[PDB]
Design an enzyme around this catalytic site. Sequence first.
Site, short mmCIF file in Angstrom:
data_model
loop_
_atom_site.label_atom_id
_atom_site.label_comp_id
_atom_site.label_asym_id
_atom_site.label_seq_id
_atom_site.Cartn_x
_atom_site.Cartn_y
_atom_site.Cartn_z
N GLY A 33 -3.67 -9.06 0.66
CA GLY A 33 -2.78 -8.30 0.56
C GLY A 33 -1.19 -9.40 0.66
CD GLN A 64 2.90 -11.91 4.24
OE1 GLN A 64 2.18 -11.19 3.09
NE2 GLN A 64 1.85 -12.86 4.88
CG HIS A 69 0.21 -5.62 6.35
ND1 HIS A 69 -0.60 -6.15 7.87
CD2 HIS A 69 0.06 -7.12 6.01
CE1 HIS A 69 -1.04 -7.63 8.51
NE2 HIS A 69 0.00 -7.63 6.77
CB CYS A 102 -0.32 -10.94 8.96
SG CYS A 102 0.49 -11.39 8.24
CG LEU A 103 -2.73 -14.19 4.14
CD1 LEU A 103 -2.54 -13.94 2.66
CD2 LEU A 103 -4.36 -15.00 4.57
#
Lengths: 167, 168
Positions: B46, B51, B133, B91-92
């Site tokens: 995701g 981001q 998220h 999380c990326l």
Amino acid sequence: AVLEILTAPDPRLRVQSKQVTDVASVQTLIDDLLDTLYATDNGIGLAAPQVGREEAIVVIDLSDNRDQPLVLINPKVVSGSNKEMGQEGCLSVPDYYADVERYTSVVVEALDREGKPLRIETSDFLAIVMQHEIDHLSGNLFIDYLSPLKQQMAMKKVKKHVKNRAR
Amino acid sequence: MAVLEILTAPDPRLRVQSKQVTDVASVQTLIDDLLDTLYATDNGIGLAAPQVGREEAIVVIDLSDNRDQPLVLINPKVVSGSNKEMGQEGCLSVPDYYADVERYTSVVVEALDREGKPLRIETSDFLAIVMQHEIDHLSGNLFIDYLSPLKQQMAMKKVKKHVKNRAR
Ligand SMILES: [Cl-]
Ligand SMILES: [Cl-]
Ligand SMILES: [Zn+2]
Ligand SMILES: [Zn+2]
Ligand SMILES: [Zn+2]
Ligand SMILES: [Zn+2]
Ligand SMILES: [Zn+2]
Ligand SMILES: [Zn+2]
Ligand SMILES: [Zn+2]
């Protein structure tokens, strides 16, 4: 389907590599090691035990453009000087970084992918990378040099990474 | 053919309140670039627009092994949910840090799809967690925000090691 990189613990990461006697027979593996290396985000060195192979072969590319492959067949560290601590990671111990002592000047002898002798003498970051990659061929991971606690922490981090789904 | 850079914490761009999309045709490029960026990650499932430093309220998800099941959520909102449980997340934009976070394990989300058509997703599968998220990112929230200030500090430390590292 590029080869997959193994993560600790995996007994294939702990096998002693075997010398290559017939360089022509390992050309596919060399190309596959390079494809796997380059399929990673930020990988700069990959050793054959990291894809489950026993042949003594390392590939490294430290260039920004990722167009400068160094292939080392049957590599050995022949000498070294100037021990220093420096942070390392490893694609086979994902997400865990720690300081490891290495020679900051080194001489390595190996064969290139055509089977010609190679002698690399270096005091650059390459020295650290070669030592790291060559250690794989002895069945060694960089975490092996760390305190027991750090080793435990590393294994716990790898497991989280491996078991995680949501990113 | 570069993809967009995924930003890592700390970064003020991760903390913006995303803006509602009113012209769906105008963000098709972004939607595609988001998906390409996501598919270029080793295992991301995701990604939210903040981001990559973008203000639009858009999230892209793909839970499939093959990576041929894109889900595009424009202006997503959690309408309801139930059965809160702790579950590990990463999380990326907070690479290399994993922790347990509370989410509804059953959720209802409303959004638009990439064509601007209404979408209502009611799920008890892992998608519920992923949607929560990713929607959180559009409110400028990271999963570590639910953790103690000390765990947050540790997360930042691990991200920094990752960012600074060379030898791999
Ligand atoms: Cl192992
Ligand atoms: Cl931040
Ligand atoms: Zn390596
Ligand atoms: Zn390694
Ligand atoms: Zn990682
Ligand atoms: Zn990870
Ligand atoms: Zn995500
Ligand atoms: Zn995230
Ligand atoms: Zn990392």
